[PDB]
């Protein structure tokens, strides 16, 4: 009940040749760029509040500690977003992206729509390193603005660092997005009617991407309510460790799991994106 690299490649070619494949890229896609990971982001700013960094981490998850940090002082969460915009969107991560085999294999394919859940600019900047044009879509003013027709639309599902009022980082903002009323959510409601999705760079214990996987399947079955039940397109999830229980759960959420080789994790995702071509 788990695909390999070689038997997922003719299934991902067919969805790409007819323009119906959308990558949905997570935080493990930004792993070769050597970015901070929240274990030293707000644990470093915990010394401003007055804690020890190993002891601030003790009181909850990162989204809960960020909610405490936002209700502490007026204009305090913007200290973290400006610190993330200098660490994630730094010139050292620009130079690693230009040599990264995943970001080259992603940008060598003519995509129409890319979703990503991470706040850095390295999916758009990957397309612009290959000489292609990308349109960043985070806010209502971005959807309203003018574009061309051929341009790949990069949808920032949890916001951009240069528009800090779009960031989904507080636990309350994660809870607010489960209603699916944000502008990236309204775009997702129409894209799931027509497209297949390729999820890259998530864990099985993420619990935000598992809700989206449940809720996409529910909106896809609610779509064909009055009409007869027709066989829909299949979504995909590329992993380096699949295991023995979680691939069987995602089958009822219209998701096939692709087992990639865990010996070199960045090379195996690069071989998956190069077989779509």
């Amino acid at each position: 009940t788990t695909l390999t690299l070689s038997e997922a490649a003719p299934l991902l070619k067919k969805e790409f040749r007819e323009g119906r494949l959308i990558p949905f890229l997570g935080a493990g896609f930004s792993k070769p760029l050597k970015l901070p990971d929240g274990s030293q982001l707000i644990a470093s700013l915990a010394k401003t509040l007055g804690f020890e960094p190993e002891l601030f981490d003790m009181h909850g998850r990162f989204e809960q500690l960020a909610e405490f940090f936002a209700i502490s002082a007026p204009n305090r969460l913007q200290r973290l977003v400006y610190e993330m915009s200098l660490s994630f969107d730094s010139a050292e991560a620009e130079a690693l992206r230009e040599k990264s085999p995943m970001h080259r294999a992603l940008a060598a394919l003519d995509w129409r729509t890319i979703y990503t859940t991470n706040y850095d600019k390295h999916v758009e900047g990957a397309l612009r390193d290959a000489g292609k044009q990308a349109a960043v879509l985070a806010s209502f003013a971005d959807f309203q603005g003018p574009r061309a027709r051929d341009v790949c639309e990069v949808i920032k599902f949890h916001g951009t660092l240069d528009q800090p009022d779009t960031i989904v980082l507080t636990e309350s903002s994660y809870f607010q997005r489960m209603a699916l009323d944000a502008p990236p959510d309204q775009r997702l409601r129409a894209d799931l009617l027509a497209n297949s999705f390729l999820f890259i760079g998530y864990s099985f214990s993420d619990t935000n991407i598992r809700y989206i996987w449940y809720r996409m399947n529910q909106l896809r079955e609610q779509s064909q309510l009055g009409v007869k039940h027709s066989q829909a397109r299949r979504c995909f999830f590329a992993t380096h460790g699949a295991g023995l229980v979680q691939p069987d759960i995602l089958q009822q959420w219209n998701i096939d799991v692709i087992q990639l080789d865990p010996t070199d994790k960045s090379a195996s995702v690069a071989r998956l994106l190069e077989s779509i071509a």
């Binding site: 007055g50 190993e54 002891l55 003790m58 009181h59």
Partner: protein
Amino acid sequence: APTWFYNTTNSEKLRELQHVLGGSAKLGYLTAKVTEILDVDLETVIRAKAIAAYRAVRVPVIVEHGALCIDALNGLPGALVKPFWESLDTRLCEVIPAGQRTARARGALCYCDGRERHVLIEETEGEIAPSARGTGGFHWDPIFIPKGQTRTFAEMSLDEKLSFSPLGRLHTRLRTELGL
């Protein structure tokens, strides 16, 4: 209401604590089971044990750990009190070479109110004993002899031991820093 909650799982350490700080109105007692961190260094164990205890109880907590450092074994046990005691109860008087026969007994407290940690460390050394002598103690008290004494820890009374042991001077220092 209590403010600080001492956490322990060994019932004999609890009796020696309440002999000293039992009349303190603002010290509670908990017996939450925490996973013991294994390392030779005492400073590292007691500082990591306070996080594992605060995750269990989420009140301002006090923890404690002991260590024995033998100069004829280059540390060893150190703060590995659990895996040696599970196999070598009092046989350390025999697996030691009979030549040097010198060791150090160390204790450590740590109190964490959720923000900061503070570690108190007290140390006592005399020698190790040839034979397990005495009954009243815990974990290596029959085979430890301080300097200037011929009488072990477990051969002494409870008031005699706390005048010599590391854990007797830590509980005096714990009073004057937390009020208690």
